Amino acid sequence: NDDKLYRADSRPPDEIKQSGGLMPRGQSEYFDRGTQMNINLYDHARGTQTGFVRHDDGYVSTSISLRSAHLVGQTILSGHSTYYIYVIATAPNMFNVNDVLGAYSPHPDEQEVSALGGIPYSQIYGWYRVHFGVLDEQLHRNRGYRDRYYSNLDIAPAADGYGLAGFPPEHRAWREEPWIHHAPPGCGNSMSNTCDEKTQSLGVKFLDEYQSKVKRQIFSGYQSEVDIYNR
Amino acid sequence: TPQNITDLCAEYHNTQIHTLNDKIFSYTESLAGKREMAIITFKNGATFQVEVPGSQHIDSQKKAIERMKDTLRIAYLTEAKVEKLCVWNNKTPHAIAAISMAN
Amino acid sequence: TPQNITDLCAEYHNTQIHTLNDKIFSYTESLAGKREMAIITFKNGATFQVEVPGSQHIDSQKKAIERMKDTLRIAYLTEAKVEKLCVWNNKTPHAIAAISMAN
Amino acid sequence: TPQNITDLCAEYHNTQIHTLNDKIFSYTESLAGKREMAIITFKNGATFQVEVPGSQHIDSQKKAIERMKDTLRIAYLTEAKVEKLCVWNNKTPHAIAAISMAN
Amino acid sequence: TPQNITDLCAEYHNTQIHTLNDKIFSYTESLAGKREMAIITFKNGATFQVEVPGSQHIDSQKKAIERMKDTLRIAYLTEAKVEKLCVWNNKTPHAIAAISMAN
Amino acid sequence: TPQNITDLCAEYHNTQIHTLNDKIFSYTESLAGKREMAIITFKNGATFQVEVPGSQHIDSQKKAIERMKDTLRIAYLTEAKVEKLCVWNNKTPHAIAAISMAN
Numbered sequence: 001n002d003d004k005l006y007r008a009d010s011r012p013p014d015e016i017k018q019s020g021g022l023m024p025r026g027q028s029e030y031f032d033r034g035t036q037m038n039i040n041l042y043d044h045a046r047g048t049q050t051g052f053v054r055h056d057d058g059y060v061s062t063s064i065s066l067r068s069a070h071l072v073g074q075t076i077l078s079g080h081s082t083y084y085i086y087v088i089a090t091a092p093n094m095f096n097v098n099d100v101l102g103a104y105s106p107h108p109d110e111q112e113v114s115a116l117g118g119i120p121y122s123q124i125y126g127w128y129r130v131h132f133g134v135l136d137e138q139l140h141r142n143r144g145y146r147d148r149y150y151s152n153l154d155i156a157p158a159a160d161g162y163g164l165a166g167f168p169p170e171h172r173a174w175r176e177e178p179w180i181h182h183a184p185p186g187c188g189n190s191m192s193n194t195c196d197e198k199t200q201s202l203g204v205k206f207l208d209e210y211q212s213k214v215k216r217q218i219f220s221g222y223q224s225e226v227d228i229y230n231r
Numbered sequence: 232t233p234q235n236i237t238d239l240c241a242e243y244h245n246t247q248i249h250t251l252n253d254k255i256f257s258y259t260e261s262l263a264g265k266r267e268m269a270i271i272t273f274k275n276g277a278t279f280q281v282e283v284p285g286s287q288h289i290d291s292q293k294k295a296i297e298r299m300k301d302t303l304r305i306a307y308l309t310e311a312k313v314e315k316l317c318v319w320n321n322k323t324p325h326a327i328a329a330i331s332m333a334n
Numbered sequence: 335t336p337q338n339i340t341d342l343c344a345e346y347h348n349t350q351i352h353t354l355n356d357k358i359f360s361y362t363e364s365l366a367g368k369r370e371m372a373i374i375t376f377k378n379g380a381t382f383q384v385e386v387p388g389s390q391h392i393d394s395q396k397k398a399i400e401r402m403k404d405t406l407r408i409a410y411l412t413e414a415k416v417e418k419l420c421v422w423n424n425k426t427p428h429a430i431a432a433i434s435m436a437n
Numbered sequence: 438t439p440q441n442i443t444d445l446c447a448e449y450h451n452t453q454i455h456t457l458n459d460k461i462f463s464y465t466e467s468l469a470g471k472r473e474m475a476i477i478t479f480k481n482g483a484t485f486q487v488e489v490p491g492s493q494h495i496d497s498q499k500k501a502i503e504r505m506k507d508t509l510r511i512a513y514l515t516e517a518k519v520e521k522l523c524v525w526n527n528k529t530p531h532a533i534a535a536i537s538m539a540n
Numbered sequence: 541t542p543q544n545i546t547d548l549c550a551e552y553h554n555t556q557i558h559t560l561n562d563k564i565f566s567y568t569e570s571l572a573g574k575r576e577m578a579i580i581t582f583k584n585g586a587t588f589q590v591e592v593p594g595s596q597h598i599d600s601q602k603k604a605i606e607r608m609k610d611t612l613r614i615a616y617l618t619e620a621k622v623e624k625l626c627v628w629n630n631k632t633p634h635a636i637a638a639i640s641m642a643n
Numbered sequence: 644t645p646q647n648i649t650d651l652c653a654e655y656h657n658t659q660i661h662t663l664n665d666k667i668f669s670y671t672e673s674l675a676g677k678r679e680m681a682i683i684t685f686k687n688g689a690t691f692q693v694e695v696p697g698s699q700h701i702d703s704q705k706k707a708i709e710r711m712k713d714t715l716r717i718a719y720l721t722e723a724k725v726e727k728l729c730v731w732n733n734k735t736p737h738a739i740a741a742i743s744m745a746n
């Protein structure tokens with residue numbers, strides 16, 4: 001459906017366009033996975049926010065309302081004289097953190113939805129401007145957005161996420177419902193570090209597969225048809 | 232001059248409208264001799280062809296056949312919802328005459 | 335030589351500008367013989383054609399007709415905002431002569 | 438007329454189906470004289486050609502050869518899953534007759 | 541053989557480089573008789589055409605004129621940054637000879 | 644028949660491989676008379692052309708030249724990684740004979 005999510009960020013629209021979207025820490029470009037990135041939801045969710053709204057460990061956070069995003073924004077970014085609130089379509093790269101982490105969600109009050117690998121430009125509906133903590137309530141539309149594609153999609157269900165929860169290898173969660181039914185090999189199950197390596201490889205495989213879907217939706221329309229008979 | 236696919240399909244004998252309101256499930260393309268054609272299916276199993284060019288086609292249709300193959304390929308890739316197809320049903324698979332995309 | 339669609343449209347008889355500032359709502363395409371054409375609509379109900387190539391057209395327009403159908407297809411699929419259309423008003427639906435995209 | 442790639446492929450001698458269900462790993466294209474062709478590989482190492490046009494081809498295949506190279510290029514760039522290929526096995530690498538994309 | 545657009549432009553009389561380093565603001569295309577052309581603008585108001593094919597053009601340029609309209613349409617729709625145009629400045633608006641894209 | 648770009652390039656005396664494993668930095672296209680060509684650069688300054696069609700080309704190569712310019716344009720816009728180029732090295736810039744794309 002056409003629901004939107006919201007994120008406060010000091011990186012301005014031109015940086016977003018150049019990066020191909022809203023990126024997790026340490027990634028300069030969406031589709032370019034030439035650099036190392038740890039992907040782990042639990043670590044993402046328990047990370048501290050020091051002048052950046054949570055974007056570590058391979059995910060990028062959103063709020064479920066504009067009010068909530070604005071509140072978050074005042075808390076973290078009040079030292080900036082300008083920042084942006086990005087309005088974001090729902091799609092299956094988004095996970096409801098409370099639902100996936102359950103009772104172990106570290107900040108349940110925040111009601112976070114987090115995007116694995118960050119948010120591609122095409123998924124960004126638009127952006128508001130915030131000046132000196134004051135929300136300017138004009139919405140600037142992104143020409144790159146695709147409404148029919150994204151309005152036909154929703155966030156990922158929690159059961160697509162349980163296996164990516166990223167709890168420590170011997171955490172009680174891996175032996176409790178629901179996570180027990182989705183535990184990566186080595187997690188609550190003779191080379192060291194299997195759980196960590198499988199958590200990471202399942203994340204990388206998810207993002208590979210997701211990026212394939214984005215490439216298909218966007219790059220398809222770069223196809224220029226040729227007059228085959230003339231040629 | 233028709234203003235929509237239903238009125239256009241009504242001008243021709245041996246046609247019918249199929250209402251799909253769905254994206255294309257599969258796209259098949261062939262360059263084999265005497266089978267230079269495309270075939271699409273939908274998730275319910277409904278199958279449609281773009282016919283091999285032949286004596287049933289006037290010269291002005293040759294370029295439109297090529298255009299239709301282009302349209303189905305990019306519709307498949309972009310997952311565009313197909314609203315309706317106008318087909319001839321004196322062929323199997325039913326043969327595409329026109330396509331509409333909305334929503 | 336004109337510098338914009340309005341001035342170009344003013345050089346022809348039986349033509350007018352429509353200002354849509356909106357994406358295309360539907361795209362229809364036909365390969366049926368003598369109806370090799372495309373039809374677009376907008377959510378306000380306005381309907382437009384790219385005409386079948388015919389004796390009214392000169393040679394230089396043949397390639398341009400094919401290009402215009404290609405442009406409407408990709409405009410529909412990428413949800414690009416159509417600014418204006420220059421159309422002939424002596425056809426029903428009105429027949430596209432030019433398109434401008436902005437914003 | 439066949440309803441699918443498997444049936445189409447059984448109409449011809451010296452052919453077989455390869456089931457890939459995977460995106461293309463590499464795409465190669467050449468304009469070098471007597472080697473105007475394309476080559477694709479999958480991550481499992483399976484390699485396939487679109488043949489150089491020659492006297493084994495009838496005239497109706499010429500346009501279809503060009504379309505297939507367009508299809509493979511965009512499939513590669515979009516990371517679209519290839520379901521099956523129908524190929525001639527009396528050439529090295531196996532020569533593409535038809536492709537299906539699904540899922 | 542020039543290595544870049546600036547050196548290419550220097551080989552021709554009545555040409556100049558515009559350095560833009562910006563996306564196209566508007567794209568206009570016409571199929572009207574004797575005006576089969578494209579026009580682009582930038583947000584500073586700079587306006588350019590791809591000319592109607594005519595007697596000033598040699599045969600080898602006719603495919604290249606078609607390619608250039610393809611290129612401008614897709615650059616516009618994908619918001620691609622245009623670095624420079626090479627244009628003939630004995631036409632109004634200035635007529636495109638070459639384009640470079642980069643960031 | 645070769646199964647990869649390295650083996651294809653080894654079939655010609657005046658060609659060599661370049662390994663890039665990078666996206667294209669810039670794309671330039673010209674319709675100017677006698678310079679109907681494309682030029683690409685990488686961020687390390689490596690520069691390549693698609694040559695103007697000429698008397699060194701056999702008829703079969705003419706359609707492949709046109710295809711290769713389309714390929715470079717979409718590779719540029721998608722930021723696809725170019726793996727290798729096979730080029731004629733008796734020309735300046737080196738002239739593309741083949742391209743391979745892979746991650």
Ligand SMILES: *O[C@@H]1[C@H](O)[C@@H](O)[C@H](O)O[C@]1(*)CO
Pocket residue numbers: 348385390391392395422424425429572573
């Ligand atoms: O069809 C267009 C218009 O409706 C007609 O009056 C004129 O004669 O030809 C136009 C096509 O170029």
Ligand SMILES: *O[C]1[C@@](*)([O])[C@@](*)(O*)[C]([C][O])[O@@](*)(*)C1(*)(*)O*
Pocket residue numbers: 469470657694699700731733734738
């Ligand atoms: O020499 C010459 C070179 O340079 C090139 O052009 C080729 C193409 O094919 O040819 C010859 O070899």
Ligand SMILES: *O[C]1[C]([C](*)[O])O(*)[C](O*)[C@](*)([O])[C@@]1(*)[O]
Pocket residue numbers: 554591596597628630631635675676
């Ligand atoms: O039309 C332009 C170019 C295109 O080749 O040709 C020259 O002769 C003209 O001066 C210029 O306007």
Ligand SMILES: *O[C]1[C]([O])[C]([O])[C@@](*)([O])[C]([C][O])O1*
Pocket residue numbers: 263264451488493494525526527528532
């Ligand atoms: O039938 C002949 C050959 O035996 C095959 O290997 C292919 O080259 C086909 C192409 O139609 O032609």
Ligand SMILES: OC[C@H]1O[C@@H](O)[C@H](O)[C@@H](O)[C@H]1O
Pocket residue numbers: 170
């Ligand atoms: O991290 C060390 C622990 O690892 C678990 O896999 C094991 O069940 C425990 O008994 C303890 O050895």
Ligand SMILES: OC[C@H]1O[C@@H](O)[C@H](O)[C@@H](O)[C@H]1O
Pocket residue numbers: 245282287288289292319321322326366367
């Ligand atoms: O123009 C195409 C159509 O031609 C008719 O003669 C035929 O009966 C239809 O099935 C369809 O092929």
Ligand code: NA
Pocket residue numbers: 001002003089090091150151152153154155
């Ligand atoms: Na959605």
